Write a protein that binds this ligand. Sequence first.
Ligand code: VO4
Length: 157
Amino acid sequence: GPMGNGMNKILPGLYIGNFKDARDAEQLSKNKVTHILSVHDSARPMLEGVKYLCIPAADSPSQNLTRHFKESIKFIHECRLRGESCLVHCLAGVSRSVTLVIAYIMTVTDFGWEDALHTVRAGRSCANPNVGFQRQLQEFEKHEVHQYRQWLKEEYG
Ligand code: VO4
């Protein structure tokens, strides 16, 4: 469906879901989620015992998300390196959250944005960044993802 079927594993320790999944204590415990990246209009820490990164962003092609790629990647990566699980979510888990996860995948692999989106869709079929976000991912692939990959190597080995 258009808001998924529950939070979905994309990579070990990295999940995408909708806003309901993000407060579902059963899903959070089953998937051992200790970090939540909430990227939506009124994003704020909700549940105790979880570490949050909140990004106020609209699901509009006018919304810039590139400014937030580096902080999102750091947050996801530091959680995954300590063996913990991170959930990235927006309202529906289709566009804003997916775009941040694509940028992460692109940085930890040699994938362009389309192969990263394929990876997301294998776990979460509804994934579909809006056209403004697709444009931003294409510019990231052409001019910046190589800088982010080098940064990741120098920072984390
Ligand atoms: O709540 V999202 O529309 O960016 O899938």
